[PDB]
């Protein structure tokens, strides 16, 4: 056993590292992927603040998925106080949610493609480069994300940190013109995401037929079971979410418990294996001490006493019994989620009444009861829990998808050549600012 460390990780959101024990062949025996993002402490600073402010603060946990936290936080407040929002407010929230999932999955295409090969060649995608096919692909992705952000801005008030959601529904309904504009854009987007999806699935399928990849000049073998783990999955909806107001909620808070990294991470180790050629800048210096239990910045939520995988694959496994697992299965399931986003937007626009009410007539102030809301963020189940009393948050808790995925991905690192541990990581589409909040 030797210990190699990659710090920082790259082509994901935010700040983490991989602390890896490897065998004499460089295959991970036990690896820890951990947040080293400072804890801004949103759960504790929320206490005493107003139920209107806390969702707008929680939004600023993450600018890729602020819709997830805005909606999950707002709907946790609504669940605690017992506020039923109007239909047209819900329809606008779903449109906002679906649009953001498009932009997020497409942004993630940008981050993972450099690890992938132009099918049938030994050339990797370089999306910066003004050459084909990369530039044509970048142009499609860029238009996809532009459409997505535009719809999000129209239905949510703002693409990043949406302003329209409020306790009890929305500040604004949209105009007949705005509704036509969103429909026009969704029609254009649906064709584009079908193209991007088929493109990505082909690239992934080419990856599954490869035997090695090139990292830092060297050939790295591709295990058949790359990224396999035995944690199973958790998901609350295929699209939107669930909350404790529902007749039959699809998440069970009696099965959840959160520990410190303590229960699940390695203690102190010393780095004795270093590779200065790891692109670009090498790995952690020999002699460095690391302690994942103490350095990890997240809590570890569990379901039935164990870490779980959340995210697109978790959703398709839970709701369609999708039956492939590991790194390339995760990539596949994410791409498959493209069309539902556009069909959902178009169906929601069809049902939206632009003269309809968007704010509940009565917003109660709460008595301290616990409520919770789950939003199926692009990366998986985002669960916010709250006690609101007299309009103030007395208790707040956030179980964010990448928080769930950190210990699970770690276990999935077993069997990988340490030089492609980052590829295992990127199939989770990590958001480490999310994970840490």
């Amino acid at each position: 056993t030797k210990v190699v460390e990659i710090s920082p990780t790259t082509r994901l959101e935010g700040h983490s590292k991989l602390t890896l024990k490897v065998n004499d062949q460089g295959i991970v025996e036990r690896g820890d992927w951990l947040s080293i993002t400072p804890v801004r402490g949103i759960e504790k600073l929320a206490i005493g603040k107003t139920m209107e402010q806390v969702p707008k603060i929680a939004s600023r946990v993450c600018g890729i998925c602020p819709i997830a936290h805005t909606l999950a936080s707002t709907e946790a407040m609504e669940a605690s106080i017992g506020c039923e929002i109007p239909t047209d407010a819900k329809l606008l929230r779903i449109i906002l949610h679906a649009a953001n999932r498009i932009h997020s999955h497409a942004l993630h295409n940008i981050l993972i493609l450099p690890d992938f090969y132009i099918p049938g060649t030994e050339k990797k995608f370089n999306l910066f480069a003004n050459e084909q096919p990369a530039r044509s692909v970048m142009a499609r992705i860029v238009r996809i994300r532009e459409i997505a952000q535009t719809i999000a801005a129209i239905a949510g008030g703002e693409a990043i940190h949406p302003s329209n959601p409020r306790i009890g529904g929305m500040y604004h309904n949209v105009s007949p013109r705005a509704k036509q504009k969103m429909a026009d854009l969704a029609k254009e987007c649906l064709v584009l995401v079908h193209e991007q999806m088929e493109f990505m699935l082909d690239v992934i399928r080419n990856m599954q037929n490869r035997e090695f990849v090139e990292v830092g000049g060297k050939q790295i073998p591709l295990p058949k079971k790359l990224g396999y783990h035995n944690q199973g999955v958790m998901a609350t909806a295929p699209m939107y979410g669930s909350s404790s107001l529902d007749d039959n909620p699809t998440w069970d808070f009696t099965r959840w418990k959160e520990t410190r990294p303590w229960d699940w991470y390695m203690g102190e180790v010393t780095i004795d294996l270093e590779d200065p050629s790891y692109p670009i800048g090498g790995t952690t210096k020999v002699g460095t001490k690391a302690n994942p239990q103490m350095e990890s910045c997240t809590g570890v939520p569990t379901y039935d006493g164990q870490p779980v995988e959340v995210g697109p694959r978790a959703r398709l496994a839970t709701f369609k019994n999708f039956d492939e697992k590991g790194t390339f299965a995760q990539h596949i399931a994410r791409q498959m989620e493209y069309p539902d986003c556009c069909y959902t937007i178009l169906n929601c626009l069809d049902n939206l009444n632009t003269s309809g009410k968007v704010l509940a007539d009565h917003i109660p102030q709460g008595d301290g009861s616990m409520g919770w809301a789950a939003n199926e963020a692009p990366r998986g189940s985002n669960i916010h829990l709250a006690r609101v009393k007299d309009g103030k948050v007395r208790w707040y808790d956030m179980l964010v998808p990448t928080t769930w995925n950190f210990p699970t991905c770690s276990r999935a690192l077993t069997g990988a050549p340490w030089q492609i541990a980052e590829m295992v990581v990127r199939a989770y589409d990590p958001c480490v600012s999310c994970a840490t909040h």
Partner: protein, 252 residues
């Protein structure tokens, strides 16, 4: 010659980077012709901070995180121009409210905008910051370093109010409109602050700003956008020409 640009991610949400990317083909145009992205953990595999002409720095600094403090000091050392990108970097924003006590780093208690630890050349305020502003600053930074004298003169005039904001301080709030506009005899009731506020904390009552201070997330946008904070007539009166210049620089 392309200038060298890095994106440095401190205690931010990456929404500032998303805002840059939301210039769409404008960003690709800039990366094609005017600028090399030498560093960005989100998009590229350069692991350590290299030399930069322009560092776009987002997020604030956790005083109790050693690597973070070293990163922001190293960034100033490595960069000709330091840009506080977005309100967290400029003004602390939601991290003003951080107070520790959360797992798994309950000692991660104190956060300051980057201007309290290093000297900052340029503020780009906003939460989220507007894509167009980030684009204008990138283009003008290039013109300031690779243009003819007529361009470098324009660029210097364009950036001056954003440099003045960096010298003014590291605090942003609804109160800026009281302290420095209404209380100064300068408010004329235009309502711009209300449009810019990302959380709808500002209403106008009889033509005057009314701030919901317990909704305000201290981003500094409203004073920035207010036309009685800075109003540099030499630049803004030439809006048609400066707009045409920026468009031409992005054209295909």
């Amino acid at each position: 010659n392309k200038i060298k640009i890095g994106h440095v991610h401190m205690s931010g949400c990456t929404g500032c980077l998303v805002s840059l990317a939301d210039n769409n083909l404008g960003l690709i145009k800039i990366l094609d012709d005017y600028a090399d992205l030498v560093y960005c953990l989100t998009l590229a595999d350069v692991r350590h901070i290299p030399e930069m002409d322009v560092a776009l720095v987002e997020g604030s600094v956790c005083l109790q995180d050693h690597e973070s403090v070293e990163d922001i000091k190293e960034t100033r050392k490595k960069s000709k121009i330091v840009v506080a990108l977005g309100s967290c970097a400029c003004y602390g924003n939601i991290t003003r409210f951080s107070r520790g006590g959360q797992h798994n780093q309950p000692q991660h208690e104190s956060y300051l905008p980057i201007g309290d630890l290093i000297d900052v050349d340029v503020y780009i305020p906003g939460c989220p910051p507007s894509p167009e502003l980030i684009r204008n600053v990138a283009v003008m930074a290039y013109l300031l370093l690779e243009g003819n004298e007529e361009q470098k003169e324009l660029a210097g005039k364009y950036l001056k109010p954003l440099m003045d904001l960096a010298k003014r301080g590291t605090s942003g709030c609804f109160c800026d409109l009281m302290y420095d506009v209404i209380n100064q005899g300068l408010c004329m009731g235009c309502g711009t602050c209300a449009a810019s506020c990302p959380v709808h904390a500002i209403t106008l009552e009889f033509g005057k700003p009314q701030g919901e201070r317990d909704l305000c997330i201290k981003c500094g946008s409203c004073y920035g956008a207010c036309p009685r904070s800075f109003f540099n007539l030499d630049v803004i009166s030439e809006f048609e020409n400066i707009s045409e210049i920026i468009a031409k620089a992005l054209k295909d």
